[PDB]
Ligand binder design. Sequence first.
Ligand SMILES: Cc1ccsc1CNC(=O)[C@H](CCc1ccccc1)NC(=O)[C@@H](NC(=O)c1ccc(OCc2ccccc2)cc1)[C@@H](C)O
Ligand SMILES: [Mg+2]
Ligand SMILES: [Mg+2]
Ligand SMILES: [Mg+2]
Ligand SMILES: [Mg+2]
Lengths: 212, 237, 235, 242, 241, 222, 233, 233
Amino acid sequence: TTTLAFRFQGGIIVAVDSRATAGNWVASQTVKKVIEINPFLLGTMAGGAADCQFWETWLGSQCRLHELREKERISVAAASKILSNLVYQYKGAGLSMGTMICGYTRKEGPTIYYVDSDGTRLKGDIFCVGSGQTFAYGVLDSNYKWDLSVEDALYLGKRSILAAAHRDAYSGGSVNLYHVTEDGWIYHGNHDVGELFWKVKEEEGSFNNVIG
Amino acid sequence: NSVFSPDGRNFQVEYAVKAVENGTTSIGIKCNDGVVFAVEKLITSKLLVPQKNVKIQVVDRHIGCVYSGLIPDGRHLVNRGREEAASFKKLYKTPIPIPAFADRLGQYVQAHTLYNSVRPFGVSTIFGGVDKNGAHLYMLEPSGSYWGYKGAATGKGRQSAKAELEKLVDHHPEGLSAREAVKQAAKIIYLAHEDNKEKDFELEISWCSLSETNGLHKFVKGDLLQEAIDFAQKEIN
Amino acid sequence: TIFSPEGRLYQVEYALESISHAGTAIGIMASDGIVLAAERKVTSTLLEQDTSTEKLYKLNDKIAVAVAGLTADAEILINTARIHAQNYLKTYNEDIPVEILVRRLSDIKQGYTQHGGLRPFGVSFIYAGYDDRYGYQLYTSNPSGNYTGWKAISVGANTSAAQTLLQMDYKDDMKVDDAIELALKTLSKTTDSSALTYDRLEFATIRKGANDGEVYQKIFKPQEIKDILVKTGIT
Amino acid sequence: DRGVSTFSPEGRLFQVEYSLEAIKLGSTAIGIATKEGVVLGVEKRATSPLLESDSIEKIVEIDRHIGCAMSGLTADARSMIEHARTAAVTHNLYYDEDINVESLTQSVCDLALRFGEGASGEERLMSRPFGVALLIAGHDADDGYQLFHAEPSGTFYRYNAKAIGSGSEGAQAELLNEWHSSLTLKEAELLVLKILKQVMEEKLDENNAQLSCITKQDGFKIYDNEKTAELIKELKEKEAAE
Amino acid sequence: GYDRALSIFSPDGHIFQVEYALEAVKRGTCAVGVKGKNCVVLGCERRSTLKLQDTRITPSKVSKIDSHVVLSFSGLNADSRILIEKARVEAQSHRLTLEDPVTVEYLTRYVAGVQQRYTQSGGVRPFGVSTLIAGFDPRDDEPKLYQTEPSGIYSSWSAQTIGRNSKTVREFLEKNYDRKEPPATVEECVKLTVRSLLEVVQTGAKNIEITVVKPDSDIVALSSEEINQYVTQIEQEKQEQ
Amino acid sequence: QFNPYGDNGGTILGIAGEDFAVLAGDTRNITDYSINSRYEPKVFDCGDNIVMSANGFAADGDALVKRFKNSVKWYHFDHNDKKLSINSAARNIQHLLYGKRFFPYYVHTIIAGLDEDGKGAVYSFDPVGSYEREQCRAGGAAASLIMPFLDNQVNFKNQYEPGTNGKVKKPLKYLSVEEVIKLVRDSFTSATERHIQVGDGLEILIVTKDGVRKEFYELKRD
Amino acid sequence: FRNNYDGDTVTFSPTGRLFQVEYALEAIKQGSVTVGLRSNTHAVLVALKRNADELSSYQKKIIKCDEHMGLSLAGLAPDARVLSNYLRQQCNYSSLVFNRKLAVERAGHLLCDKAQKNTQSYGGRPYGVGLLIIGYDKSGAHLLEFQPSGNVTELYGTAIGARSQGAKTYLERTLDTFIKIDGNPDELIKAGVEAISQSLRDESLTVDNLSIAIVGKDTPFTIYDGEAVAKYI
Amino acid sequence: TQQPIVTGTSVISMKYDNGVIIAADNLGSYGSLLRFNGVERLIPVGDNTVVGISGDISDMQHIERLLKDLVTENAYDNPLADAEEALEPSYIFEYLATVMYQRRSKMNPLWNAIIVAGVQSNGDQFLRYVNLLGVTYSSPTLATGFGAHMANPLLRKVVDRESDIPKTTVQVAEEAIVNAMRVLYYRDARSSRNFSLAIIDKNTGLTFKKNLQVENMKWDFAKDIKGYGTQKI
Ligand SMILES: Cc1ccsc1CNC(=O)[C@H](CCc1ccccc1)NC(=O)[C@@H](NC(=O)c1ccc(OCc2ccccc2)cc1)[C@@H](C)O
Ligand SMILES: [Mg+2]
Ligand SMILES: [Mg+2]
Ligand SMILES: [Mg+2]
Ligand SMILES: [Mg+2]
């Protein structure tokens, strides 16, 4: 699994791969590793599939409950801390998740929280999580700039997953892309690594380790 | 309930007895190797299905119970009796002796006359069966009182039934067979019906005899039931 | 626990009614100490004066109470109060601030006022204490669970009378020796007995510890009361 | 005075009956169900001119497809809404769908039953029935727009229209005449607004009365003060011309 | 152990115990809250009966719940302590989990919920207390004032009063409070708050206490010398024709 | 030590058509190297036009199916006889599985039916409740054998247009129910040839707007 | 005699009577009429539904318990919900554990025992609802009458509710005819709809009045409401 | 956590045209000590069902008591206990399978392998297996332990699929069982010569044979076997 999220000039980019494994067996290439908690909130999934799916869906319920109770969208900080504190209650029981809770609110600005099953919760501008995290990090860090355009930042996200999908055996399938702004999240499409790799090699002149 | 009157009585228990007196008449007859139970079933309407509102209950395999009063209370008491009999068999392997079983019910019923939060049971229960050393018949009042019986009756027709029951003990001092007592049970129920004549009735008999049922509780049905009905109809006139 | 159509708590008012018959207890707070004086309920020659304390109890080294009401009820509350102080000491390595201890007790009393259908404690307290935030403090609490702070105060019998006399002669710059004098005078005037003799009194001070910088609780021995009853001029 | 769940000789539960009286004391609420939505309206009833009228919450959202109006001891309604909201959200968590309006109402009426101690069967964590009635209104795929009336007795009825509160007797017979199956949403908004004006002690404006609806398309919405004002204007002009 | 129901319905539809809890509030010392353009002021009366008190140590009526929200009350003094403590706990817990202080509405909704719960639980009696809760939401200049009662009902008020003779001061406040022209400053808001008490207090010495709240956790208590200056100026200015 | 788990073999396969779905599974149940039964069904009609298989440890499989069938029954009781849609069933099963997250049902579970718009649908779950909608999915023993075949012959993967220099793909057209059944039977004969736990019989459950249809085919018994 | 003796379900009257239980019985007579009857092949429930207003819905009187069992209610409706829930569970337990359809008679015994515990507990109250339970089991068609006292009796036919005495006299008269309506559902339903007529000071019974339920040999328990009952008026 | 102590070995069974046959030897082993020599491991329940149990004998005696407690309980308030509401083989099986599964799930199993054999009320043959894990399966032939490895292959030569069942006579099936028992005696070190066998026939009823023995054993050929390779004398 490779997942990333970064903050920049014009909001948040969120990008994930779509491969699921059991040992060396590739179980799925079409897995959805982003949950759309609401029009203004995304969550990413790394670690145990069930653990993330189940608890981040539950998170969405908890957030819906906040809105009905308080007549206002939940803050990123609070949504993250709910999932954070839940996970903490289960510490040492075997839960396995690496997660990013991403969104924009009026009061906070665009915000990313990293939350794992150890109970760690961090606010930051750049995060990569999963078996291919280091690969994504290598491209991301070297080409990142706050001032990047929306078009460019989306590409850097897309390109970083691809980097990781190429090197990490446990990442691959397709890249799923997301942009988060003032006004909320917009899907930026599914991108099969099958086609994407050859396109990127051709247009960019990168990946020379690759014969033919 | 937990209230003694100034003269040492328990008015609530005494009132519970009135609920018993109000009920259908039921009887039990002890024979030389078994026991017979019989009960009067008031036919409120032609809409009641014949033979299909069974009043007599079995506890374990060897015990029969009949009761007069608040029927639901009787069922509550039999449920408990069954738990109490299962528990006994679980620990001691042997099925519960009848005196042992009587006391189990006895203590349970008495307990319901100790606390202000509960009412006494609104039934008198006639019960018994065959154990390791003979046949046993018991009757248990709402107070928890119980003794052994040669014959027992309770409910609306209790007085005439007792009179008939007292007569049998005098004519047969040396025993009385299971096959005979089944007939006699039909008779006594018919005589006791005199009081509730405004409505029709249905007769239910059951027995537990060492030689006739192999010490197991069995309902009297078919040819044996009809023959007993005949005897009762023929001796009423 | 229930309310009356007036918005009063029957059982509390009746508990307070019970208290008005208990022996008067008096607290007076001076700048350099505190006085606690209380009258024992009409006794007998055969009562062991030396080994008796029915009205004055030590809570910790710096806090004490004068009791008015059911003694057995008070002993229950005192014992828990003693524990609460030791819990605080264990947790913070500081002696419990007087108000915190008073509030706690007052809350336990408020509890019986609001749930559980148990009778309230038939007890009123005068608290005398010192801490390094508010110095000398004097508090009162009753079966309702309300508590208030005072410069001088009384509980038990004739509080109406005792309070008017204290209001008259109390002045903020009093020394402890003057407060001792007032407390005894006030009791003598409000007693329902011929004379106020030593055998009918319990007396305690919380002073600035002879010569030190520390705080000392003096619970007066029977003989010491007889001495201070002459000094002030009542013999 | 003996017990809380005792039967009268007639065969009625004492405490349930008196809670129904408590509801008659409360503010008027009206619900009208059409084929273009359901309208819910209430009387705010400020007890003083210094009360900030818009802090009076008597119409609340339960889910996007379910809203409700209340009447009676309105504090008793807090935990009923908590339970309702939770039931809706939970149902969605377990089933990835909307809770049916009828099912949400039944759930709320089960909560209403839990007065007692345990009642030799389960457990009851409440000492008295609720002193509040609810008008539960919403949309689902099976039965479209619906209006239910949830009572502290644990029963609930579906209504084409219904009024609860102090004006409820006169308002109900008024609804008896005006309601037809062809009503538009705009017509229904007006009818609630008209019938409230009739039964209210004060003169109805955009401050002592509140309107809301639920449509399949836009969900449950509480109309704001500017919008209700324009519908009051429109009511006056419609009837002054009659 | 004891869960026997104390709060029940009357034939004419009232909950008797709640209604009597209000009677306890009726007889409690008066409290008042009025909100300015950029402040909220809280005044309370103190009884005359006993006057040999110690004001350094006696619990005052206006209590801080958090650094930006305060609570005053009328009714049973002991009951109020239970509400204030719970409210303080809830405030710290809200900061812990939501990472933000409570709004004044939230804190009111919480206190009113506790109040309501005591009207429908076996073996407990309702709170003989009504509250005024005042303050400023985090990062907000718009002032807040709410009122709760033993029933569990709550709502916001431009100005309000509770306790004995609250009828008289409410009558006074309805005449002298203009919604389009709310008290423009702290000074002129405090003055209106004192005037309203002077209808009932009849004295005003250390018998009136005033707490002022401002935006962003600025809550100050007023001293005797500062209140005196208000009392003196009011009766002198308003006397002639 | 006592091991609460065992492994009863078997393979299951689910393919979603356009207006139909199939869920198939072999009818052989095994323990180590012995055969227990040659015909023990593990695909079930659960009512409401949903078919289900929970393959792996049979005791955990039956317990789950039993419990879901029951969930369907109580859905009716509580929600005025509403049809449980496939997606709602999927979500429901997730909670049943995750409910035992710390003592899992040792099953790879698959359900099949028609979605809201009447399209064929297949959902597959891991042991602890992770789930996804899929066009097709094989599960159990011979999963590793069958899945790549399906990737190739159902989603036409790595198959390009003859002569387009490997750029234009074989268009992902929809398959008929006859064409799907063929692929199933062939997948299972191949699985029977190369996996010792697959054999004996093949039972297919077909789901259309008309209900649940059943089909059976003999397999090699060695 | 009636004075200090109806405070709770835990007090006997000097006559031997339990007044709370008799008062709970009076909630039935207040409730809307409902009828049940059976042949050898089928069992039928017919209920007159009551609306609280002209704009309201007619409230339901028939609850399904299993594929082979269901009941009609008369009295406190929320109580029927409590009792049918328990009955649904007992049916469910029997299927899951023993793979057995719960006998209609045992369902009777089970409801009786549950009702009883509320005629002997302090701080509880009796159930205030009457029930008519129909089912098809391994011994054919069955109909039961349940009273909140705990008394459950098996009948060929009965009615409970307001003015119910009319229908009960009718069925007692029609006995020999309807018992033999075998293999004909629509005729038995007709015999039940005609039976509920004898209990009307009310009026014509409309397509909203009316609620019918049937179970039998090859018919799972089904509920007919509105449009689907038109053909019986 | 637990481990079997006194054990019983295979239970073997098959269906024939009219009913089922089930057999099990009368031994209770204590490890490799053949400790008890008269143990009955076939349990008649009613007289349409035999339950055959292998594994831990203490747990077997527990299930025995459970099964007897089930006959008692079914007879309670049940006038059709010896008729239509008698315990069916499937009822008894589902109950045991529930118990078995709950026990494994509580991490405290009944250390057994159980085959429930009988004839249903409609005449259908019932044959199903459950074990300590709650695993269940059904087949024309079923056996536990060694029986699984040696009896099944021989019994399957007779009834190989469903269609073989109506072609198989009581005599043929009994013979196949009797022969399988001999084979098990030859090769199972935890087996006995003495065994019980039960036939449950839809016409005959329950025939229960005690004190059977393995007959016609081949041993003569042993006399010629010398050494382990090269030895001649
Ligand atoms: C984050 C996310 C969201 C959707 S897909 C995905 C990426 N994760 C993945 O692809 C992970 C990688 C492996 C892993 C890492 C960490 C922890 C567990 C497993 N895979 C998974 O989570 C996959 N599941 C599994 O790998 C799995 C394996 C065994 C298992 O329980 C069996 C058992 C064992 C003993 C006793 C009883 C029961 C449950 C799930 C699933 C997709 O089928
Ligand atoms: Mg890779
Ligand atoms: Mg008698
Ligand atoms: Mg759905
Ligand atoms: Mg193979």
